[PDB]
Amino acid sequence: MSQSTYSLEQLADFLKVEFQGNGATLLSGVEEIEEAKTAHITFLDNEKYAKHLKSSEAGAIIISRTQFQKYRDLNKNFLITSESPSLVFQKCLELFITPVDSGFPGIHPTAVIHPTAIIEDHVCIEPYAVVCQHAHVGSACHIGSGSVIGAYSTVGEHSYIHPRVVIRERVSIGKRVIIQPGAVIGSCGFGYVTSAFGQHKHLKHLGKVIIEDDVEIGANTTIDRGRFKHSVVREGSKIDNLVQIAHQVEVGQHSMIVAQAGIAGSTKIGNHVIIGGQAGITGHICIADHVIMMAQTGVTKSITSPGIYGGAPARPYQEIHRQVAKVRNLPRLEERIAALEKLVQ
Amino acid sequence: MSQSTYSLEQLADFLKVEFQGNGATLLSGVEEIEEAKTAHITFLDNEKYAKHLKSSEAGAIIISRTQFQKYRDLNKNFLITSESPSLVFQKCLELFITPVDSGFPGIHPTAVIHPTAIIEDHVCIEPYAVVCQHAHVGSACHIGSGSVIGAYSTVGEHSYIHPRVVIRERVSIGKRVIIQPGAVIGSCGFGYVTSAFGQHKHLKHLGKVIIEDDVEIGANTTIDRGRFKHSVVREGSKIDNLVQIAHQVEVGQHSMIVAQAGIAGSTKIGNHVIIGGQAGITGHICIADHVIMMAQTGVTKSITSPGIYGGAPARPYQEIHRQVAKVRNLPRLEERIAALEKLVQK
Amino acid sequence: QSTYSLEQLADFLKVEFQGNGATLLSGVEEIEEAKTAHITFLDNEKYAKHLKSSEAGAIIISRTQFQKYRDLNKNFLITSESPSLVFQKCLELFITPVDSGFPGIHPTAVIHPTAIIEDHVCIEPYAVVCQHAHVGSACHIGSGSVIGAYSTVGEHSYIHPRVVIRERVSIGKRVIIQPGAVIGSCGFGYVTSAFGQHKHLKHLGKVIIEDDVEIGANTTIDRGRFKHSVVREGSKIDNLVQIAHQVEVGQHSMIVAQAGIAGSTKIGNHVIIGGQAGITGHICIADHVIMMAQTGVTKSITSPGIYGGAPARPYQEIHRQVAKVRNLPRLEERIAALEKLVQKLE
Ligand SMILES: CCCCCCCCCCCCCCCC(=O)O
Ligand SMILES: CCCCCCCCCCCCCCCC(=O)O
Ligand SMILES: CCCCCCCCCCCCCCCC(=O)O
């Protein structure tokens, strides 16, 4: 609704934060640091940008105490914080732009709930959502339009599920979980026995999917259920869009899987891992904790020790960095085998 | 059986196109030029050398004025146009297979429409679709069965939204846009802050997504919203299936993204660009106008000049072509040290 | 969930046992962490090391494999069938499938008067069956799914929730389709003005899914401009897969998650396409060809065998290539020091 302006000083008092420069500077929105004019509050997160600070027009830059110590002399208007400058920036963001809901509060009449399903306090089920037999929908839970909550599936308190998500049977979603539109949770794992005449016999997958607390699942991401055990995404992990997660995959706590990456069956990913965009990881292997996998990686063996890895096959960062450099240098190496065929003897 | 027969001349008059050949020739279907028979209507590509034309045994051949000039002397039945042969072929095709909707005209009773939302005239909203608060659906739109138009979002006139599409809140769709089944427009960016030794906190994404006119978005493709700025697909760009558009990516006009490709956050892609299938582009870069990236390209840095690119990391095409070759020639280069090490006399 | 003894299990399975047939067992579990109460099996090799020291109450094992471990004092169940299959027979003794609790045709189903629905068929809340569709007997139509105009579903097929089937698609007998899939979206074909502009062409071809095909979650299959796209019988397709327009997938082929096949390409019978592999348009893949994950096929393949890499090359050749690439620092040695006989200046 708004088109609000506030004074630098007003913003500071709001943010409960120290400031230097004109208290009366007028600020009408937020903007990233390179683009920002005198109308905008902005931030610098960590040194990545730097060059963009002394030239910036920003009428206010949100800064940390160390960065203020580092940039003290520059003639800018600062808001000095001890929290993440990006996280203080978010507070400003939320001043100018407020979230918006669908405008269908509580349980819409068109929402179908099976008699055996248990509905908790303060829940919101949107038009045309379907809750199946013996499902548990938690307290303060949001279920979006045309979403499905399958048989025996449970959705822990404060979870938010966007429009057209499919939560198959026997899936348990933890607390404070966010699922973007299109996500499929609990699809059949891709398991066959090929007969001698080359015909593929389906193996009925009767496992579960466990998605733990504070996990996020992206748009149109598909997580398959295990054959008999469980596919698991552990507490705090964040999964981007269009991601494959095959039967009996386990993802650790506080891990990140970027868009369009895929992980084959019975692979375990450790805690605090990053899987880069469009990466691929085979079945029946492990990734150790604190591993970062670059974008477009093909990982063919377990990665046993922490560090950065890239390429396909995946090799440690230094080894692949060298490999690329040497491949670019083949023309210059043939030139050296050339000069050598200058031999008279 | 064929629902229809026409004479060359009858069809010429239907198409509003000149003809050259035998006006009485009978025509009862369409086929591609290398498979067409006497009863068939076909078109001349734009490629396809003279040999394709000559040995074609087809009742009629849709051709352009320029091409005709070059092939005046050939005894074929020609349907000569100043438009694109294919576009004209299209109309011919539509005489043998007629397009079919779902059979639910106008606004279905089961559609749910928030009182605060404004639905223009002549709109088709199919069964079980939801239109949220302060949404605006323009005149002559189609909202597919079960699709969702989010809070405050706008759809321009003559847009076709197929079934089970999610348009999230604050999304702007222009005129004549087509969105395939299952697409997701305005999901949240993948943007987090890291605290407590690598725990990831959610950052509310409150920017919009802007889709300009004549843009097409393929099936199950996902287009995230910016953090505060906007994700933008410009005029006339066409996006395939299973594509990822990351937070606040800007795509130029008349650019093409092929299936399964992905652009990471905050990247600019200029006009007349083509991103081949299953490609990846990192965040915070630029692709100049008129760039073509081959399938499975992995782009790591900006591209500032036009032309074809491939490989991962992406290099100009000339480059990865020599590379593949020198790599392939590795044994034959090692064989040359199996000989240039025998000469080690004294 | 109950308990059985080895002997009872052997007799149920019609399979021979070795070890003590009094051993009580009550569940299943992967080969490593199987206790005396768990049944397990061995059907690859990468977990074979876990056998010597595994504690399973029962190990289902092939006649061939049994030779290598029959000396160990583990309880074995020995079969000449698929160990995995025999294992499945056990699995189903402890866990049972669950339906949604909505039998037959839910009153919210919206069915067009001109559609035909056979006997003994389930249609779950808010499904939408459009004009001139036919749904065979013993079919399951999952919640919020769409069956488009003139589309048919063969008997005993299972459509999971939120599946979209567009116009003129024919699903064969006993097919499974996972949530989110999209069958019969528009092919990615445009007429490109010389000027750069891209013009839409309604795709009107039919799409055919033959009996026993399985299609994965969120997989998208496009229809041809006017000619047909076919998935021949028995083929299994995984999640997030792109099948572009006019593709023929031969019979009993496997396509793994996130693969993509480009336009009007023909895949043989008994073909395996690995995860994230890509195949260009207008080419051919011979019978019994196996692509590895992340393969990039750029040319037709005609000889059966294992293929990998990008561009695709036969197994032993890409192996050797990776090998010679890794070797490059070592090969530079034999060069650096080969050059350092400019000491032959004397
Ligand atoms: C230095 C050599 C590394 C090997 C080259 C491949 C990956 C480089 C890392 C940057 C990202 C690659 C492009 C994919 C981007 C994406 O999908 O989001
Ligand atoms: C880039 C596709 C256009 C066709 C022109 C031929 C260029 C060679 C194909 C690029 C190499 C990658 C092969 C995978 C193809 C795909 O994913 O669709
Ligand atoms: C980009 C490939 C060319 C180079 C040589 C290719 C052989 C090794 C790469 C195989 C990747 C296997 C990773 C599995 C990915 C997945 O499961 O989806």
Side-chain angles (χ1 to χ4, degrees), chain C residues 31-48:
Chain C
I31 184 148
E32 301 95 321
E33 54 268 3
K35 76 173 276 89
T36 346
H38 302 146
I39 300 153
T40 202
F41 75 101
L42 167 78
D43 225 5
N44 33 307
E45 267 320 80
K46 27 171 80 206
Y47 297 141

PDB file of all heavy atoms in Angstrom, chain C residues 31-48:
ATOM      1  N   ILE C  31      21.913 -54.406   4.204  1.00  0.00           N
ATOM      2  CA  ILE C  31      22.882 -55.477   4.521  1.00  0.00           C
ATOM      3  C   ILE C  31      23.821 -55.247   5.726  1.00  0.00           C
ATOM      4  O   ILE C  31      24.090 -56.182   6.492  1.00  0.00           O
ATOM      5  CB  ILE C  31      23.678 -55.904   3.253  1.00  0.00           C
ATOM      6  CG1 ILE C  31      24.612 -57.079   3.562  1.00  0.00           C
ATOM      7  CG2 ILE C  31      24.420 -54.712   2.629  1.00  0.00           C
ATOM      8  CD1 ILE C  31      24.824 -58.014   2.380  1.00  0.00           C
ATOM      9  N   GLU C  32      24.300 -54.011   5.885  1.00  0.00           N
ATOM     10  CA  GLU C  32      25.167 -53.639   7.012  1.00  0.00           C
ATOM     11  C   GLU C  32      24.474 -53.854   8.357  1.00  0.00           C
ATOM     12  O   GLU C  32      24.739 -54.836   9.055  1.00  0.00           O
ATOM     13  CB  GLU C  32      25.613 -52.175   6.919  1.00  0.00           C
ATOM     14  CG  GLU C  32      26.392 -51.797   5.669  1.00  0.00           C
ATOM     15  CD  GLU C  32      25.531 -51.198   4.559  1.00  0.00           C
ATOM     16  OE1 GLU C  32      24.388 -51.667   4.332  1.00  0.00           O
ATOM     17  OE2 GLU C  32      26.023 -50.255   3.899  1.00  0.00           O
ATOM     18  N   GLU C  33      23.566 -52.939   8.693  1.00  0.00           N
ATOM     19  CA  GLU C  33      22.940 -52.896  10.012  1.00  0.00           C
ATOM     20  C   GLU C  33      21.782 -53.874  10.190  1.00  0.00           C
ATOM     21  O   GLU C  33      20.822 -53.578  10.898  1.00  0.00           O
ATOM     22  CB  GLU C  33      22.483 -51.469  10.341  1.00  0.00           C
ATOM     23  CG  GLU C  33      21.567 -50.829   9.292  1.00  0.00           C
ATOM     24  CD  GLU C  33      22.316 -50.026   8.226  1.00  0.00           C
ATOM     25  OE1 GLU C  33      23.566 -50.008   8.251  1.00  0.00           O
ATOM     26  OE2 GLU C  33      21.648 -49.401   7.363  1.00  0.00           O
ATOM     27  N   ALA C  34      21.863 -55.042   9.572  1.00  0.00           N
ATOM     28  CA  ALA C  34      20.824 -56.029   9.783  1.00  0.00           C
ATOM     29  C   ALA C  34      21.159 -56.845  11.025  1.00  0.00           C
ATOM     30  O   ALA C  34      22.282 -57.314  11.182  1.00  0.00           O
ATOM     31  CB  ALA C  34      20.667 -56.911   8.562  1.00  0.00           C
ATOM     32  N   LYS C  35      20.192 -56.982  11.924  1.00  0.00           N
ATOM     33  CA  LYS C  35      20.377 -57.796  13.119  1.00  0.00           C
ATOM     34  C   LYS C  35      19.716 -59.152  12.908  1.00  0.00           C
ATOM     35  O   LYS C  35      19.161 -59.420  11.841  1.00  0.00           O
ATOM     36  CB  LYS C  35      19.801 -57.096  14.360  1.00  0.00           C
ATOM     37  CG  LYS C  35      18.265 -57.140  14.457  1.00  0.00           C
ATOM     38  CD  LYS C  35      17.715 -56.577  15.778  1.00  0.00           C
ATOM     39  CE  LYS C  35      17.715 -57.622  16.902  1.00  0.00           C
ATOM     40  NZ  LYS C  35      18.991 -57.643  17.674  1.00  0.00           N
ATOM     41  N   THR C  36      19.771 -59.992  13.938  1.00  0.00           N
ATOM     42  CA  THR C  36      19.202 -61.335  13.904  1.00  0.00           C
ATOM     43  C   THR C  36      17.697 -61.347  13.621  1.00  0.00           C
ATOM     44  O   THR C  36      17.119 -62.402  13.331  1.00  0.00           O
ATOM     45  CB  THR C  36      19.433 -62.055  15.238  1.00  0.00           C
ATOM     46  OG1 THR C  36      20.410 -61.335  15.993  1.00  0.00           O
ATOM     47  CG2 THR C  36      19.904 -63.500  15.010  1.00  0.00           C
ATOM     48  N   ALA C  37      17.065 -60.180  13.718  1.00  0.00           N
ATOM     49  CA  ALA C  37      15.628 -60.076  13.502  1.00  0.00           C
ATOM     50  C   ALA C  37      15.316 -59.643  12.074  1.00  0.00           C
ATOM     51  O   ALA C  37      14.161 -59.691  11.646  1.00  0.00           O
ATOM     52  CB  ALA C  37      15.006 -59.120  14.512  1.00  0.00           C
ATOM     53  N   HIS C  38      16.355 -59.253  11.338  1.00  0.00           N
ATOM     54  CA  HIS C  38      16.201 -58.711   9.980  1.00  0.00           C
ATOM     55  C   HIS C  38      16.576 -59.665   8.849  1.00  0.00           C
ATOM     56  O   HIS C  38      17.570 -60.390   8.936  1.00  0.00           O
ATOM     57  CB  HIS C  38      16.996 -57.411   9.828  1.00  0.00           C
ATOM     58  CG  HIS C  38      16.598 -56.348  10.799  1.00  0.00           C
ATOM     59  ND1 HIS C  38      17.497 -55.449  11.325  1.00  0.00           N
ATOM     60  CD2 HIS C  38      15.398 -56.055  11.354  1.00  0.00           C
ATOM     61  CE1 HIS C  38      16.867 -54.634  12.152  1.00  0.00           C
ATOM     62  NE2 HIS C  38      15.592 -54.980  12.189  1.00  0.00           N
ATOM     63  N   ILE C  39      15.760 -59.642   7.794  1.00  0.00           N
ATOM     64  CA  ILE C  39      16.063 -60.297   6.521  1.00  0.00           C
ATOM     65  C   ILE C  39      16.783 -59.284   5.645  1.00  0.00           C
ATOM     66  O   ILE C  39      16.439 -58.104   5.678  1.00  0.00           O
ATOM     67  CB  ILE C  39      14.777 -60.728   5.796  1.00  0.00           C
ATOM     68  CG1 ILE C  39      13.979 -61.696   6.657  1.00  0.00           C
ATOM     69  CG2 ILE C  39      15.092 -61.339   4.427  1.00  0.00           C
ATOM     70  CD1 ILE C  39      12.509 -61.665   6.357  1.00  0.00           C
ATOM     71  N   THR C  40      17.769 -59.739   4.866  1.00  0.00           N
ATOM     72  CA  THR C  40      18.501 -58.869   3.926  1.00  0.00           C
ATOM     73  C   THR C  40      18.848 -59.587   2.604  1.00  0.00           C
ATOM     74  O   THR C  40      18.449 -60.734   2.405  1.00  0.00           O
ATOM     75  CB  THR C  40      19.748 -58.232   4.602  1.00  0.00           C
ATOM     76  OG1 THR C  40      20.125 -57.043   3.899  1.00  0.00           O
ATOM     77  CG2 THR C  40      20.922 -59.208   4.664  1.00  0.00           C
ATOM     78  N   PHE C  41      19.563 -58.912   1.702  1.00  0.00           N
ATOM     79  CA  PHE C  41      19.992 -59.517   0.430  1.00  0.00           C
ATOM     80  C   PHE C  41      21.242 -58.851  -0.140  1.00  0.00           C
ATOM     81  O   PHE C  41      21.632 -57.768   0.303  1.00  0.00           O
ATOM     82  CB  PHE C  41      18.867 -59.463  -0.605  1.00  0.00           C
ATOM     83  CG  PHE C  41      18.653 -58.104  -1.198  1.00  0.00           C
ATOM     84  CD1 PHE C  41      19.155 -57.792  -2.451  1.00  0.00           C
ATOM     85  CD2 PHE C  41      17.951 -57.132  -0.506  1.00  0.00           C
ATOM     86  CE1 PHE C  41      18.959 -56.526  -3.000  1.00  0.00           C
ATOM     87  CE2 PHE C  41      17.754 -55.877  -1.054  1.00  0.00           C
ATOM     88  CZ  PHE C  41      18.261 -55.574  -2.299  1.00  0.00           C
ATOM     89  N   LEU C  42      21.850 -59.496  -1.132  1.00  0.00           N
ATOM     90  CA  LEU C  42      23.043 -58.980  -1.804  1.00  0.00           C
ATOM     91  C   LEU C  42      22.843 -58.962  -3.326  1.00  0.00           C
ATOM     92  O   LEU C  42      22.790 -60.028  -3.950  1.00  0.00           O
ATOM     93  CB  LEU C  42      24.242 -59.857  -1.425  1.00  0.00           C
ATOM     94  CG  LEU C  42      25.571 -59.775  -2.183  1.00  0.00           C
ATOM     95  CD1 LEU C  42      26.367 -58.555  -1.752  1.00  0.00           C
ATOM     96  CD2 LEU C  42      26.358 -61.058  -1.954  1.00  0.00           C
ATOM     97  N   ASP C  43      22.726 -57.773  -3.929  1.00  0.00           N
ATOM     98  CA  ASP C  43      22.424 -57.686  -5.381  1.00  0.00           C
ATOM     99  C   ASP C  43      23.229 -56.672  -6.203  1.00  0.00           C
ATOM    100  O   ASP C  43      22.709 -56.094  -7.170  1.00  0.00           O
ATOM    101  CB  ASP C  43      20.916 -57.487  -5.631  1.00  0.00           C
ATOM    102  CG  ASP C  43      20.376 -58.384  -6.757  1.00  0.00           C
ATOM    103  OD1 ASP C  43      21.146 -59.225  -7.283  1.00  0.00           O
ATOM    104  OD2 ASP C  43      19.175 -58.264  -7.104  1.00  0.00           O
ATOM    105  N   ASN C  44      24.487 -56.468  -5.808  1.00  0.00           N
ATOM    106  CA  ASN C  44      25.478 -55.687  -6.576  1.00  0.00           C
ATOM    107  C   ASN C  44      26.897 -56.212  -6.285  1.00  0.00           C
ATOM    108  O   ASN C  44      27.193 -57.371  -6.617  1.00  0.00           O
ATOM    109  CB  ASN C  44      25.345 -54.156  -6.359  1.00  0.00           C
ATOM    110  CG  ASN C  44      24.874 -53.774  -4.940  1.00  0.00           C
ATOM    111  OD1 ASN C  44      23.852 -54.270  -4.448  1.00  0.00           O
ATOM    112  ND2 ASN C  44      25.609 -52.858  -4.298  1.00  0.00           N
ATOM    113  N   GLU C  45      27.752 -55.368  -5.690  1.00  0.00           N
ATOM    114  CA  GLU C  45      29.035 -55.790  -5.089  1.00  0.00           C
ATOM    115  C   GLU C  45      29.620 -54.800  -4.070  1.00  0.00           C
ATOM    116  O   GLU C  45      30.313 -55.210  -3.136  1.00  0.00           O
ATOM    117  CB  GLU C  45      30.091 -56.172  -6.143  1.00  0.00           C
ATOM    118  CG  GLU C  45      30.144 -57.669  -6.502  1.00  0.00           C
ATOM    119  CD  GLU C  45      29.967 -58.596  -5.302  1.00  0.00           C
ATOM    120  OE1 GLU C  45      28.814 -58.806  -4.864  1.00  0.00           O
ATOM    121  OE2 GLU C  45      30.976 -59.139  -4.807  1.00  0.00           O
ATOM    122  N   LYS C  46      29.331 -53.509  -4.237  1.00  0.00           N
ATOM    123  CA  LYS C  46      29.909 -52.456  -3.372  1.00  0.00           C
ATOM    124  C   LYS C  46      29.588 -52.560  -1.859  1.00  0.00           C
ATOM    125  O   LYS C  46      30.235 -51.903  -1.032  1.00  0.00           O
ATOM    126  CB  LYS C  46      29.619 -51.037  -3.917  1.00  0.00           C
ATOM    127  CG  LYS C  46      28.346 -50.882  -4.765  1.00  0.00           C
ATOM    128  CD  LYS C  46      28.037 -49.406  -5.079  1.00  0.00           C
ATOM    129  CE  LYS C  46      28.867 -48.832  -6.239  1.00  0.00           C
ATOM    130  NZ  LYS C  46      29.036 -47.345  -6.148  1.00  0.00           N
ATOM    131  N   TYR C  47      28.604 -53.396  -1.510  1.00  0.00           N
ATOM    132  CA  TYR C  47      28.306 -53.726  -0.109  1.00  0.00           C
ATOM    133  C   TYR C  47      28.709 -55.166   0.252  1.00  0.00           C
ATOM    134  O   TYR C  47      28.491 -55.602   1.383  1.00  0.00           O
ATOM    135  CB  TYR C  47      26.814 -53.516   0.216  1.00  0.00           C
ATOM    136  CG  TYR C  47      26.291 -52.088   0.104  1.00  0.00           C
ATOM    137  CD1 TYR C  47      25.014 -51.834  -0.415  1.00  0.00           C
ATOM    138  CD2 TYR C  47      27.065 -50.991   0.519  1.00  0.00           C
ATOM    139  CE1 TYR C  47      24.519 -50.523  -0.518  1.00  0.00           C
ATOM    140  CE2 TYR C  47      26.581 -49.674   0.411  1.00  0.00           C
ATOM    141  CZ  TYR C  47      25.310 -49.451  -0.107  1.00  0.00           C
ATOM    142  OH  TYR C  47      24.831 -48.161  -0.210  1.00  0.00           O
ATOM    143  N   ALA C  48      29.292 -55.896  -0.703  1.00  0.00           N
ATOM    144  CA  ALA C  48      29.684 -57.301  -0.494  1.00  0.00           C
ATOM    145  C   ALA C  48      30.655 -57.494   0.671  1.00  0.00           C
ATOM    146  O   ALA C  48      30.555 -58.482   1.405  1.00  0.00           O
ATOM    147  CB  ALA C  48      30.252 -57.907  -1.774  1.00  0.00           C
TER     148      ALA C  48
END
